[PDB]
Ligand binder design. Structure first.
Ligand code: HEM
Ligand code: HEM
Lengths: 146, 149
């Protein structure tokens, strides 16, 4: 539509910008279930194989509690990592930022598997922060929340 | 402090993702002159020989005085077209969107010359809009202007 289409554009744009194989952005509602879930790097066939949508339970729920960008050379190092459900493709390098405006958080933007086992840089972080802010404006524009 | 590197990254990713040969991002000051001019797709002979920075005099200011994106098959069939100074590459397809945040317009981001003479698409314009809004965030964060502080 308009939000979905802009969210998809951001995820695609961020992955390209930071040169990541995969990207997602989830936006969650009042019940903490997703309203918007947009992902890059995986076709519809593997998507259906993965099955359930994420619960945002580990590193990603660290991202929503904190407001902090999370930038990791290996996500399994992080205390709150829970690992991946079967068929989900393996990923180690992780760059995730919150999607936000004012003191409101809507969800997150996250990228994995930077080309060759290269770590994400701070350059990369600032770009993903710029795009996650563009995503905050887009959600706030669409309204969606009280 | 990364502002310039950020904009150069944005312009580069824009041009490539939309298949344009050329792309540029200009931010102007309170005095209507460029503060930042980022461009992609040209050598140094050429850049030196274009000479003078653009004044934002035609289609580029159409984007200035009213937001909304401009997407054209042929630059010269916009009633604002001024043309190009000598040495500047000829450009026919155009895709332009204002760079901005809140009620502030800091500049414009633009692409020309989709490969194969193809025209810019809606999807092309959506992506660029996304990158331009991120560029406005980046200009805003940089506290370059008083309506940021
Ligand atoms: C294509 C880009 C994707 C990226 C960048 C991505 C990222 C991640 C990351 C970093 C984790 C780590 C969990 C942790 O250790 O805390 C994870 C787990 C998980 N992912 Fe993905 N993912 C993608 C695609 C998908 C898709 C398409 C689905 C499902 C339809 C999905 C569903 C899940 C589920 C159910 C988990 C278990 C954790 C949870 O519920 O939060 N992912 N993903
Ligand atoms: C490489 C990416 C570039 C793009 C996409 C681009 C785009 C354009 C476009 C579309 C116009 C026509 C405006 C109109 O006719 O209404 C134009 C004109 C012009 N360009 Fe470029 N340009 C690029 C590079 C440059 C560079 C590097 C310079 C100077 C160093 C320059 C200087 C000018 C000048 C002086 C004009 C005449 C209009 C004005 O003064 O605003 N251009 N350009």
């Amino acid at each position: 539509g308009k939000l979905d289409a802009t969210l998809r554009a951001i995820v695609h744009t961020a992955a390209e910008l930071v040169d990541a194989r995969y990207g997602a952005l989830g936006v969650r509602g009042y019940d903490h279930r997703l309203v918007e879930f947009v992902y890059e790097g995986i076709d519809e066939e593997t998507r259906h194989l993965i099955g359930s949508l994420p619960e945002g339970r580990g590193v990603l729920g660290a991202l929503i509690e904190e407001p902090k960008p999370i930038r990791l050379d290996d996500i399994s190092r992080h205390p709150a990592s829970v690992g991946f459900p079967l068929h989900h493709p393996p990923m180690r390098t992780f760059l995730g930022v919150p999607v936000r405006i004012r003191d409101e958080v809507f969800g997150n933007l996250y990228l994995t598997e930077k080309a060759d086992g290269q770590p994400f840089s701070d350059d990369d972080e600032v770009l993903v922060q710029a795009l996650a802010a563009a995503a905050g404006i887009a959600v706030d524009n669409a309204r969606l929340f009280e």
